[PDB]
């Protein structure tokens, strides 16, 4: 239903144990030295 100005899709490859870290409010090597999701978010992490 909704409408917005743009949708930003970012893509990475992280090993399974670290998929938890790419979320809001997580700390570790991946979310602190490599990619940091903002504290507030409206988005859907998807991993296969």
């Amino acid at each position: 239903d909704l409408c917005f100005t743009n949708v930003y899709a970012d893509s990475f490859v992280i090993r399974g144990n670290e998929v938890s870290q790419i979320a809001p409010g997580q700390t570790g090597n991946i979310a602190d030295y490599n990619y940091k999701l903002p504290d507030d978010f409206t988005g859907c992490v998807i991993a296969w």
């Epitope: 144990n17 700390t27 570790g28 602190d32 030295y33």
Partner: antibody, heavy 117, light 107 residues
Framework: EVQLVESGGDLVQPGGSLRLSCAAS????????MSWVRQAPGKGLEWVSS???????FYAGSVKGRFTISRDNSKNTLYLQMNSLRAEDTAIYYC???????????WGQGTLVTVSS | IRMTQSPASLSASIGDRVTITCQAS??????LNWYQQKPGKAPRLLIY???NLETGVPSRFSGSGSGTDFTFTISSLQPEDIATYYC?????????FGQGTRLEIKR
Amino acid sequence: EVQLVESGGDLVQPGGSLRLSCAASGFIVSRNYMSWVRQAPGKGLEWVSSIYSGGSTFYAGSVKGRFTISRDNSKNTLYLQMNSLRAEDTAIYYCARDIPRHGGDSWGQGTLVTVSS
Amino acid sequence: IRMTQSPASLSASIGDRVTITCQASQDINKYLNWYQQKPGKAPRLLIYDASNLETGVPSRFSGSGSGTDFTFTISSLQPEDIATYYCQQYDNLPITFGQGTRLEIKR
């Protein structure tokens, strides 16, 4: 030489607050991974806390909210503020620098904490 | 991880071939370090990653493993080798050590 005189602590009543201090020879504390192991007398070493190169703090289950870790840029001296102690925390505490994957280590001689009544 | 070391009293004569086995409860891949703690003196790091012995060590200690079960070997048992060896995994946040295998010498 990476030699550590991590020497602080001797003992307090149950419910006290002790302050450890570590120290540093070739490196700077705030740039390398460091952690604090805990060796009870006659028992396998157990892991209490760990700091990262950007300030991330991780604790153990038994020390959630009683223990604190803190890193001091000015004089090395990785600080570990023991608070809300008890009568089963008696163990030898070793300061430890762990470079994560490339492999070197410092475990300093370590200090004794016997906290009792 | 429920780290498991199977030999705790193992006693070999001068110059023998022994082996220590540290076992885990999940796949830790290759991130398991082998330590050596002499009596009183602070532990030393002997084999980081489970497959790399640190430089400056004598060249007898070798270790190899992957996934759950790991093994530690001693090639020449010099008399000045009495200590307690520990296996540590350093990438799962609840870092759990092993029990130690107190090694002694027989004569």
